[PDB]
Design an enzyme around this catalytic site. Structure first.
Site, mmCIF file in Angstrom:
data_model
loop_
_atom_site.group_PDB
_atom_site.id
_atom_site.type_symbol
_atom_site.label_atom_id
_atom_site.label_comp_id
_atom_site.label_asym_id
_atom_site.label_seq_id
_atom_site.Cartn_x
_atom_site.Cartn_y
_atom_site.Cartn_z
ATOM 1 N N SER A 119 -0.742 35.249 -73.606
ATOM 2 C CA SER A 119 0.705 35.333 -73.795
ATOM 3 C C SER A 119 0.958 35.565 -75.279
ATOM 4 C CB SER A 119 1.407 34.080 -73.304
ATOM 5 O OG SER A 119 2.804 34.183 -73.483
ATOM 6 N N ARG A 120 1.190 36.823 -75.649
ATOM 7 C CA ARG A 120 1.319 37.164 -77.061
ATOM 8 C C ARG A 120 2.612 36.637 -77.662
ATOM 9 N NH1 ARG A 120 0.111 43.358 -76.015
ATOM 10 N NH2 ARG A 120 -1.306 42.965 -74.252
ATOM 11 N N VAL A 121 3.682 36.586 -76.886
ATOM 12 C CA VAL A 121 4.939 36.075 -77.407
ATOM 13 C C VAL A 121 5.129 34.667 -76.878
ATOM 14 C CG1 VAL A 121 6.059 38.257 -77.796
ATOM 15 C CG2 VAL A 121 6.071 37.287 -75.563
ATOM 16 N N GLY A 122 4.023 33.998 -76.575
ATOM 17 C CA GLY A 122 4.073 32.691 -75.958
ATOM 18 C C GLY A 122 4.488 31.564 -76.879
#
Ligand SMILES: Nc1ncnc2c1ncn2[C@@H]1O[C@H](COP(=O)(O)OP(=O)(O)OP(=O)(O)O)[C@@H](O)[C@H]1O
Ligand SMILES: Nc1ncnc2c1ncn2[C@@H]1O[C@H](COP(=O)(O)OP(=O)(O)O)[C@@H](O)[C@H]1O
Ligand SMILES: [Mg+2]
Ligand SMILES: [Mg+2]
Lengths: 53, 487, 470, 128
Positions: free
Chosen positions: D117-120
């Site tokens: 999840s990169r924008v997690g």
């Protein structure tokens, strides 16, 4: 003898892991080769089938 | 200068007009032009488009002509006029090309003016038959110790340079070109070798720097460079090897000796695959057409060695092939291995381990080989090859390590055969079995300087005789032992 | 006869429209107006009184509307004893610069295969002097052999060693057909046969006829030169009763040339990319190379294997046409073992205890069993090491490596590579040496004592030399 | 509609593999030139122009959002098949599920070594 066996076992397992990783690398090369060949073969099948219409 | 214009550019200017035969472009696309007309055009004849482009009449069909466009099809529109030239595709040949950089069609791209060629030769000629040829006997010296000792190359041979990317294939070819300077400046005109370097699919900056390396070593004066780089049309990268091969066949047919490097043939196969797939032809293995073998084999078959009834000339080809991940059992590598007379396997493991040139001696072979060595190099290299085989079997061991470090060489440093023989002698008789390995190169350097600064007479005798006689044997023995005592 | 006009030229495929007198399929047509003789072979009838043809030479310089003349018969080549000592190309012209081949009769290169009632059954082992061949896959007099191999594994060196041994010991008008091979190799063979006296440039008593269409030829020549050489051999077999040897190298080039022209003939590609008619073309060609009740043809054929596949349709289809296959391997040649024959992939039809005897058969089966056991052990041998094998397993590996090394042999034609002098091991030496290595009579010798030797006497001598010097 | 009107939406596509299969059939019957596994050329386009409409509007445009949870059904866990390749390269992460972890009592059978999840972490709550 207990000592001088754990050492031999440690170095033998080192050799085993190294050889296993060498085989892993070579089989991975062959796997990539085979999957590229598979993609090519299926594409050529689809194309030759489309060209007969 | 003002009158360098009215020179004859106006007076002699071909301002003629002639009754020409024409066709009209029906449809340009995928680098193929369907052309209407040209009733009397020949198969594989060069036609000229309105934009000054040029093409080859590939498909003579009942109602149209398929023309392969040698250039960007951006400059061709439907309705353009296409003139015949009446000449099957051919290129300028002659000695006026030495020193010139040209593109696949023979046009100068070095800004030095036009090539003053008087003879033209077809690019798709047939290789010589069985009778015109004769077995390879004369050595083609590379100046690399490993090649010249273990994988010798004769004149009239085809020797593959095969290996991964960035393993020193172009370096081997460039050193082979630089090494011929000692022969081209000498007196014997049967040892001069005119080099040709066809660059296919390469970066144009890389070709410019290659021409620079050749000009600094004063090797351009006897070298043709045919350039069909990465941005050129696929038909041009397809044609370039045949243009270079005809430029070399000119020397092969007139009793001279040419060498040709194709750098590389994998990119020519890729360009031909592009053309074939755009022609809707059935793709075989790896999507390559069925006749990619023919593509490379009609080309590498023209590198022959004529007998003394057909002039006695030769043409040596060093095709280059780039493998993926060290796979030599691929389609195009095995095709060219089926065509050539041997290989020079460059390895990435050796290249990364500081062993440069990274030649795999166990896999490199030369089917002709022994028949084209000097006697002295044969004397020392036989024992060297035996000891290297012994060393690779057990991988004596110290002798093998010593020899393999003796085989390392620097870039742009081709050694004369006498000095290679001296170094290999000092290595193969044991005279550094006890010198620890890492100094060997140093020793080698110093040693050779010694032998070239003071014992020029021995090297001259080796050059004259070609063999290292018993007198010269003991002489070199005392030389190397005295130096080792000094070293 | 009939005259027509070229209406399309695509590569080696030329369409010719006749106004009257359409030529039957397989006929030869002469293109009019060329410096050298260009022959087109009819392949299809497109209708509209048009035919499609395959050109036996280059098609450059051909113009639509050019005249073409019909011969009325297929490609006819001169056949007879006057072909011995000569080189001829796909259409029977001499390419050795020694004048015309003045034979009394010409044969068409397209013929019918011999019937079933003409087949012969006799099976007699043909001793070649090669260890692995004579032991694990013996050849048969009058049987088709076939030598499979990838690129640069030893196909031509093996075929030339077989030439040397068998052909020199022979007395029955050998024939060599170079199909899509190196012209350099053809020149080499011509001159090594001139010096050895097999080809006599004067006072003609030659005993080999050469036919060559090499890599530089267009696909039509490379697709019919095999038939030309086949026709020469068929003449020597039928109309003389002689015992012919026929060497074909390389015969994969025939299939490959068919595949190169198949696309232009307008046919839907089969599997891989070959022509749909691969198997029937190979059958019509390969069923004529056969021994009949009239004569005997011993047929050795080199077979290229594309990209070292062996399941490529051309090798796979060739396999069924041979009596004794000899399969070379790249993995073996990278170990330095020459000839690189794969012991576990080379078969024979006379490998039968009722033909080679129980001694030979049992020794061969035991050699193969031990090599198979070694192969199956190799994986854990290279994972864990040999230090973990059973003692019986260490013994089987030791004997297997020894048998591996003993299977190699220096070749007379390979002195330039091996440095050793070529050895010609007769059959009983092979059987006895391998029987002894199996029994365990050499558990003390080093393995390198067997690499590149002749009979087992040389192996023991080499072991003694290694033990004394080192 | 909710995104453009200051509200927040969440759309699940269950699943995109079958939408790609339907498009492949449609285009193959329209005689469009097939590519890998007979998918058309723009089948990547097909999903990207769909999965790019999920955005977070700045407060000058309403401040709404649209969250997308596309589902993909691989075969034998092959994630570099054509359609999984496309949708992995399009989205901002993935939640891998495994049969082997499914039967080891790990449920939800989320393979965390592979799940991304990169924008997690920027969205997570301070306590969590
Ligand atoms: N004999 C050598 N000794 C030392 N270094 C070398 C030698 N040959 C090459 N190199 C170095 O390694 C680099 C490899 O470049 P080179 O062009 O020779 O390999 P290549 O096979 O042609 O790779 P590419 O596919 O990019 O052209 C060279 O630029 C050079 O810096
Ligand atoms: N019996 C042999 N002994 C030693 N080396 C061999 C032997 N056979 C082949 N080789 C080596 O393998 C190389 C390939 O040989 P060749 O048969 O001419 O290739 P191809 O497979 O294309 O016919 C040869 O150059 C030679 O060095
Ligand atoms: Mg390069
Ligand atoms: Mg061969």
């Amino acid at each position: 003898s207990t000592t001088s066996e754990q050492s031999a076992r440690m170095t033998a397992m080192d050799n085993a892991s190294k050889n296993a990783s060498e085989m892993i690398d070579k089989l991975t090369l062959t796997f990539n080769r085979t999957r590229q060949a598979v993609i090519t073969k299926e594409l050529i099948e689809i194309i030759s089938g489309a060209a007969a219409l | 200068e003002m009158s360098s214009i009215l020179e004859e550019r106006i007076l002699g200017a071909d301002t003629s007009v002639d009754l020409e035969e024409t066709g009209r472009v029906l449809s340009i696309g995928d680098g193929i032009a369907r052309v209407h007309g040209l009733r009397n055009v020949q198969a594989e004849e060069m036609v000229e488009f309105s934009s000054g482009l040029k093409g080859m009449s590939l498909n003579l069909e009942p109602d149209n002509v398929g023309v392969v466009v040698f250039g960007n099809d951006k400059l061709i529109k439907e309705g353009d006029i296409v003139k015949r030239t009446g000449a099957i595709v051919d290129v300028p040949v002659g000695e006026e090309l030495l020193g010139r950089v040209v593109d696949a069609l023979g046009n100068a791209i070095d800004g030095k003016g036009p090539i003053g060629s008087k003879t033209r030769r077809r690019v798709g000629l047939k290789a010589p038959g069985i009778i015109p040829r004769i077995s390879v006997r004369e050595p083609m010296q590379t100046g690399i110790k490993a090649v010249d000792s273990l994988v010798p190359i004769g004149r009239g041979q085809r020797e593959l340079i095969i290996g991964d990317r960035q393993t020193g294939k172009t370096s081997i070819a460039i050193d082979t070109i630089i090494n011929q300077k000692r022969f081209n400046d000498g007196s014997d005109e049967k040892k001069k070798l005119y080099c040709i370097y066809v660059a296919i699919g390469q970066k144009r900056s890389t070709v410019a720097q290659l021409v620079k390396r050749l000009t600094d070593a004063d090797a351009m004066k006897y070298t043709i460079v045919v350039s069909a780089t990465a941005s050129d049309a696929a038909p041009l990268q397809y044609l370039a090897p045949y243009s270079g091969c005809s430029m070399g066949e000119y020397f092969r047919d007139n009793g001279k000796h040419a060498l040709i490097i194709y750098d590389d043939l994998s990119k020519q196969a890729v360009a031909y695959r592009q053309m074939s797939l755009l022609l809707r032809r059935p793709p075989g293995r790896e999507a390559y057409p069925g006749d990619v073998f023919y593509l490379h084999s009609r080309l590498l078959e023209r590198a022959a060695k004529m007998n003394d009834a057909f002039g006695g000339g030769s043409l040596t080809a060093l095709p280059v092939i780039e493998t993926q991940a060290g796979d030599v059992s691929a389609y195009i590598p095995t095709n060219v291995i089926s065509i050539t007379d041997g290989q020079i396997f460059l390895e990435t493991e050796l290249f990364y381990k500081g062993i440069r040139p990274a030649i795999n001696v166990g896999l490199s072979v030369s089917r002709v080989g022994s028949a084209a060595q000097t006697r002295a190099m044969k004397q020392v290299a036989g024992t060297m090859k035996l000891e290297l085989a012994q060393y690779r079997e057990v991988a004596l061991l110290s002798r093998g390590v010593r020899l393999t470090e003796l085989l390392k060489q620097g870039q742009y440093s081709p050694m004369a055969i006498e000095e290679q023989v001296a170094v290999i002698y000092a290595g193969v008789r044991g005279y550094l079995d006890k010198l620890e390995p890492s100094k060997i190169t140093k020793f080698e350097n110093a040693f050779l300087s010694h032998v070239v600064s003071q014992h020029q007479a021995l090297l001259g005798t080796i050059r004259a005789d070609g063999k290292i006689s018993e007198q010269s044997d003991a002489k070199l023995k005392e030389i190397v032992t005295n130096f080792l005592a000094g070293f | 006869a009939a005259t027509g006009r070229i209406v399309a030229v695509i590569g080696a495929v030329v369409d010719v429209q006749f106004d009257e007198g359409l030529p039957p399929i397989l006929n030869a047509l002469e293109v009019q107006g060329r410096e050298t003789r260009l022959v087109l072979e009819v392949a299809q009838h497109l209708g509209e009184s048009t035919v499609r043809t395959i050109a036996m030479d280059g098609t450059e310089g051909l113009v639509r509307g050019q005249k073409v003349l019909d011969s009325g018969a297929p490609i006819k080549i001169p056949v007879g004893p006057e072909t011995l000592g000569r080189i001829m190309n796909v259409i029977g012209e001499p390419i050795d610069e020694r004048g015309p081949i003045k034979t009394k009769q010409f044969a068409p290169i397209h013929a019918e295969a011999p019937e079933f009632m003409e087949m012969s059954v006799e099976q007699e082992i043909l001793v070649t002097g090669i260890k692995v061949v004579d032991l694990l896959a013996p050849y048969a007099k009058g049987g088709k052999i076939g030598l499979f191999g990838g690129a640069g594994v030893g196909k031509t060196v093996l075929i030339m060693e077989l030439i040397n041994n068998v052909a020199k010991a022979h007395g029955g008008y050998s024939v060599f057909a170079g199909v899509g091979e190196r012209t350099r190799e053809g020149n080499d063979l011509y001159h090594e046969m001139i010096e050895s006296g097999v080809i006599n440039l004067k006072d003609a008593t030659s005993k080999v006829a050469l036919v060559y269409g090499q890599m530089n030829e267009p696909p039509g020549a490379r697709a019919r030169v095999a038939l030309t050489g086949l026709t020469v051999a068929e003449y020597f077999r039928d109309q003389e009763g002689q015992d012919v040897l026929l060497f074909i190298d390389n015969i994969f080039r025939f299939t490959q040339a068919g595949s190169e022209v198949s696309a232009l003939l307008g046919r839907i590609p089969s599997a891989v990319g070959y022509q749909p008619t691969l198997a029937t073309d190979m059958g019509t060609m390969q069923e004529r190379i056969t021994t009949t009740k009239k004569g005997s043809i011993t047929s050795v054929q080199a077979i290229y294997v594309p990209a070292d596949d062996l399941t490529d349709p051309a090798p796979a289809t060739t396999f069924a046409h041979l009596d004794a296959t000899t399969v070379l391997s790249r993995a073996i040649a990278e170990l330095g073992i020459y000839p690189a024959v794969d012991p576990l992939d080379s078969t024979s039809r006379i490998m039968d205890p009722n033909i080679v005897g129980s001694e030979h058969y049992d020794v061969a089966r035991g050699v193969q069993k031990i090599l198979q056991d070694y192969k199956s052990l190799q994986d854990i041998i290279a994972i864990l090491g040999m230090d973990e094998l059973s003692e019986e397993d260490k013994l089987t590996v030791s004997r297997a490596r020894k048998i591996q090394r003993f299977l190699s042999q220096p070749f007379q034609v390979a002195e330039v590579f091996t440095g050793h002098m070529g050895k010609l091991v007769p059959l009983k030496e092979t059987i006895k040496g391998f029987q002894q290595i199996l029994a365990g009579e050499y558990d003390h010798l080093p393995e390198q004592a067997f690499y590149m030797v002749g009979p087992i006497e040389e192996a023991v001598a080499k072991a003694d030399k290694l033990a004394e010097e080192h």
